[PDB]
């Protein structure tokens, strides 16, 4: 019924309800490190996540989510390919069923265990709603996740996952710090893209970080136990909720690093 990631409602079906699914700037895409090119005009990336603004954590049937207070500029994104200030409004995790898959964007065909997305909107549009209606309304920072050492900033979250196991559930969480999710390096690739889930609006400036972060298998496994389904329904594990790479058409992927 509702769009999804199954065989009967997965990505390859979306185009029937959202013709833009076959647009000219769809995400995610595969990053060919030796096709993408350094762009000397890109300014430095500014990830000012000083004042934490996390509010809720929830299961919306599509993925694990975190909502932030976007009333002020307490967590914004500036610099890089961006013109203006972009406000962080939410974050979600794309998880795989196996350690070898999960990420939406790929690097030279390589898939990661998962991909985190931090969504920000151009504060020049009044609100999120009017932003997505614009080509330069969104800025999504994508962060790759590989299995290994445990990520501290994720434990506290992983500890209360059972409180949002099924769709429609949510738990207050003012404890979430998007700083604890960032890798050491802020090198990235940027390209004009879209949302990776319906409506698939082509309103996104993508900033994918080259350096992945590590998470333990315990943390991963706990994320693989969320459910696509609601309470009192046949269990459907929330895994492989990622859209495969889309045609780059002839878009240019730029590197922030030489
Ligand atoms: Cu996403």
Number of neighbouring beta carbons within 10 Å of residue 73: 16
Contact 143, 207 (CB under 8 A): no
Half-sphere exposure of 94 (CA within 13 A, CB side): 26
* Rounded distance between C-alpha atoms, residue 201 and residue 125, angstroms: 16
Instruction: Return the sign of the alpha-carbon dihedral for residues 107, 110, 116, 121.
Output: positive
User: How were these coordinates obtained?
Assistant: X-ray
Number of neighbouring beta carbons within 10 Å of residue 212: 20
Instruction: Return the sign of the alpha-carbon dihedral for residues 254, 256, 257, 258.
Output: positive
The CATH number of the domain holding residue 44 is 3.10.200.10
In angstroms, what CA-CA distances link 81 with 97, 98, 181, 255?
A: 33, 33, 21, 10
Contact 11, 235 (CB under 8 A): no
Q: Which domain holds residue 21?
A: 1-258
Burial class, 241, CB count within 10 angstroms (exposed 0-12 / middle 13-18 / buried 19+) = buried
Dihedral angle, C-alpha 187, 174, 129, 164, nearest 10 °: 100
In angstroms, what CA-CA distances link 108 with 29, 145, 190, 195, 255?
A: 10, 16, 15, 21, 14
Token digits of residue 108: 């030279």
Beta-carbon contacts of 246 under 8 Å, excluding residues fewer than 6 positions away, are 26, 27, 28, 29
The Å distance, Cα 51 to ligand 1 centre, comes to 23
Which residue numbers belong to the known binding site for substrate? 196-197
Which residue numbers belong to the known binding site for Zn(2+)? 92, 94, 117
Which residue numbers belong to the known binding site? 92, 94, 117, 196-197
Which of 201, 204, 206, 202 is CA-nearest to residue 190?
206
The Å distance, Cα 232 to ligand 1 centre, comes to 27
* Rounded distance between C-alpha atoms, residue 220 and residue 222, angstroms: 5
The Å distance, Cα 68 to ligand 1 centre, comes to 16
- Exactly one of 1, 2, 15, 62 is catalytic; which is it? 62
The verdict on whether 62 is a catalytic residue reads yes
Which of 154, 59, 80 is CA-nearest to residue 114?
154
- The angle at the Cα of 221, spanning 49 to 59, to the nearest 5 degrees, equals 60
The Å distance, Cα 218 to ligand 1 centre, comes to 22
Residues with C-beta atoms within 5 A of ion ligand 1: 117, 196
The Å distance, Cα 187 to ligand 1 centre, comes to 19
Contact 91, 178 (CB under 8 A): yes
Dihedral angle, C-alpha 77, 82, 83, 88, nearest 10 °: -30
* Rounded distance between C-alpha atoms, residue 202 and residue 18, angstroms: 12
The Å distance, Cα 195 to ligand 1 centre, comes to 7
Instruction: Please give the tally of structural domains in the chain.
Output: 1
SS3 of the chain: CCCCCCCCCCHHHHCCCCHHHHCCCCCCCEECCCCCEECCCCCCEECCCCCCCEEEEEECCCCEEEEECCCCCCCEEEECCCCCCEEEEEEEEEECCCCCCCCCCEECCECCCEEEEEEEEEHHHCCHHHHCCCCCCEEEEEEEEEECCCCHHHHHHHCCHHHHCCCCCEEECCCCCHHHHCCCCCCEEEEEECCCCCCCCCCEEEEEECCCEEECHHHHHHHCCCECCCCCCCCCECCCCCCCCCCCCCCCCEECCC
* Rounded distance between C-alpha atoms, residue 198 and residue 18, angstroms: 7
């Amino acid at each position: 019924h509702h769009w999804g990631y199954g065989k009967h409602n997965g990505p390859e079906h979306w185009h029937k309800d959202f013709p833009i699914a076959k647009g000219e700037r769809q995400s995610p895409v595969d990053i060919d490190t030796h096709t993408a090119k350094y762009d000397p005009s890109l300014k430095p990336l500014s990830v000012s996540y000083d004042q934490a603004t996390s509010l809720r954590i929830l299961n919306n049937g599509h993925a694990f989510n975190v909502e932030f207070d976007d009333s002020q500029d307490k967590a914004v994104l500036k610099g890089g390919p961006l013109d203006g200030t972009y406000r962080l409004i939410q974050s979600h995790l794309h998880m795989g069923s196996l350690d070898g898959q999960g990420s939406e964007h790929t690097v030279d065909k390589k898939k990661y265990a998962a991909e985190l997305h931090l969504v920000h909107w151009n504060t020049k549009y009044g609100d999120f709603g009017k932003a997505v209606q614009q080509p330069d309304g969104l800025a999504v920072l994508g962060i790759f996740l590989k299995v290994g050492s445990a990520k501290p900033g994720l434990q506290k979250v992983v500890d209360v996952l059972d409180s949002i196991k099924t769709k429609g559930k949510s738990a207050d969480f003012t404890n979430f710090d998007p700083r604890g999710l960032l890798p050491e390096s802020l090198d990235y690739w940027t390209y004009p893209g879209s949302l990776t889930t319906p409506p698939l609006l082509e309103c996104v400036t993508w900033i994918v970080l080259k350096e992945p972060i590590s998470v333990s298998s315990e943390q991963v496994l706990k994320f693989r136990k969320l459910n696509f389904n609601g309470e009192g329904e046949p269990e459907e594990l929330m895994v492989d909720n990622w859209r495969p790479a889309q045609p780059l058409k002839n878009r240019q992927i730029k590197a922030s690093f030489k």
